[PDB]
Design a protein around this nucleic acid. Sequence first.
RNA 1: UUUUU
Length: 420
Amino acid sequence: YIPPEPSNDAIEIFSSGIASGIHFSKYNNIPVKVTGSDVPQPIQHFTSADLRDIIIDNVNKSGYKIPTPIQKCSIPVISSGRDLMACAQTGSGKTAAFLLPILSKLLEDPHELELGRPQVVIVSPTRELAIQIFNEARKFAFESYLKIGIVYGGTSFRHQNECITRGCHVVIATPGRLLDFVDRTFITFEDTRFVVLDEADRMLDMGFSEDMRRIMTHVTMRPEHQTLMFSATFPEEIQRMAGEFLKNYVFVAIGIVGGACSDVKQTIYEVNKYAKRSKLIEILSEQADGTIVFVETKRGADFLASFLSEKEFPTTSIHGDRLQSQREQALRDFKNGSMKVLIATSVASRGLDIKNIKHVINYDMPSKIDDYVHRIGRTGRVGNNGRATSFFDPEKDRAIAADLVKILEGSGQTVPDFLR
RNA sequence: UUUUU
Ligand SMILES: Nc1ncnc2c1ncn2[C@@H]1O[C@H](COP(=O)(O)OP(=O)(O)NP(=O)(O)O)[C@@H](O)[C@H]1O
Ligand SMILES: [Mg+2]
């Protein structure tokens, strides 16, 4: 496919991001928990966290005034050479929480850039999230000698291998296409001093564990390396599995682990399978701009997108059955307003940061409450408000009624009797 | 099922 190359104009490099909301201040009212031995103190300002000036400059140009709770706790820990497990609600700044200190460390204590040997490997559960992280990295490393780069499936192995063999300090990647570059020995980890697993709980779950074990357990892995794990959810059982790959690690949690973001007004409707589509148009007809509808299957996303567009709703979709180029273009169109409605499977439930997403609709409830938390988290980020509407079907979503209630109470939302 | 060479 050969995806479009990223521009270098500071106007584009800094076009990605959401402006802090009116509730930004509410962040410090959130309880903080830290566990571990001699954990460095939390920094209170970007200009007092031992960050290289280049980095701080890019932060100011990115529009940040105050670090968020996880950034305050995470930055000093990473800067200290410590391993980290960080939990913080969706849209609360976790990406910068690990890029700033890592990027800063690359300039502060430089090592020669070898070929096919990255100094930082950041892994992602989805392709679009990989490129998003990739662009934030370019944003924070803007106007420096640092070379980023990204590797992910659905693209021509040649154009990526190309960009990489020019040498990259930081490599963002999805598991599959990385194990490919690795089994073909074009990529090796002798110089990898930072291994970051974004959406870590997902990277370590049944789906990805084997591939993830192989990556981190590779015979080529530099014995001395920091391992950082971040996520808005982290089931205890997965936190135990993570520990095997962490050394004397610090644990930080802002708020309730796996807790939903309190800035998203959540509403749950009791709808039956065949009553869902009219309800959807009912809602979209009332207001359709900036809405993402989450469905259960790939075929379902495509069917619904086609339906909606035949009814005068500028709609596009994203899921695994579309060409990688269509997946990227669909996000493009949603970001610049071309498309007003985005239909998606959980391929877009985690980490995506889209300014236009003003409403999240769970057309189909997910089977796991954690997936619910990430999905509604695509809205109401950075202290801003947001709404999430979910269609609860008694015919099949009884199993998640219990966890949904807890998440609802836990985020200060109202619980409808039918869930009880 | 959804992701993931
Ligand atoms: N300190 C800050 N001040 C203002 N805005 C920020 C700040 N830090 C990050 N942001 C922005 O807010 C959005 C949320 O950051 P992001 O790193 O995607 O959060 P998250 O915690 O990773 N979310 P999720 O991946 O859904 O759990 C991004 O647009 C950032 O640009
Ligand atoms: Mg994230």
